[PDB]
Structure 1
């Protein structure tokens, strides 16, 4: 069945970005998906998106500026301490000058740079570059 709806959302975004689509439809939405998309948007990778409110579970139409090389999920959500963050950056990110790792920490859902800035580890959700 469908588990880890964040994985499906990120896979759909990746497939649409590779295909050159300007908009991608994501369903179902969730708090985690919206937070991940906001983290992406704050870094200028996806741009605006709209949450279609169904009375069962939302959908999301995401505009796709062409700036995304790859968006991916990490499963299972491994616990990431602050000292272990650099190994994950080396493994997942294409460079140390760009690319982000997204973590759910007690302070919210945030990139690895912000979590390092706030001295908090968490569980790794995914990455995008």
Structure 2
């Protein structure tokens, strides 16, 4: 059965961008999925997306602009101390010049660059570049 909604959604987006599609449909939706997409959109990696209501878990349609190379989830959600950001950047990112690691902290869901500014650790959710 399906055990992770976030992992399912990120696999659908990465698969569609590999095939050069313009839109992708994601089902089911969740609060964590929407927050993850808002971080990607703020940095300019996807574009506009829309949520459709069906009185159950919703559906999401995402528009892709072709700037996203790969996104993925990290399972299980390992803890990350504020001094451990460099270790994760070295392991799962193409370089130290671009790309983001997404964390869930007591201040909310954010990328690793913002978390370093606020000096907070948390649990690693995923990445995109």
- The answer to whether TM tops 0.5 is yes
Gaps of 5+ in 2: none
Between the aligned partners of 1:78 and 1:69, the Cα distance in structure 2 is 24
Other-structure match for 2:102: 102
Q: How high is the TM-score relative to the length of structure 2?
A: 0.98
Between the aligned partners of 2:118 and 2:62, the Cα distance in structure 1 is 29
Per-residue Cα deviation, 1:29-60 (whole angstroms, up to 9, x for no partner): 01100000000000000011001111111110
Between the aligned partners of 2:84 and 2:97, the Cα distance in structure 1 is 19
Q: CA deviation at 1:84?
A: 1.1
Give the secondary-structure state (helix, strand or coil) at the position aligned to 2:37: helix
Between the aligned partners of 2:97 and 2:85, the Cα distance in structure 1 is 15
Gaps of 5+ in 1: none
Other-structure match for 2:37: 37
Other-structure match for 1:20: 20
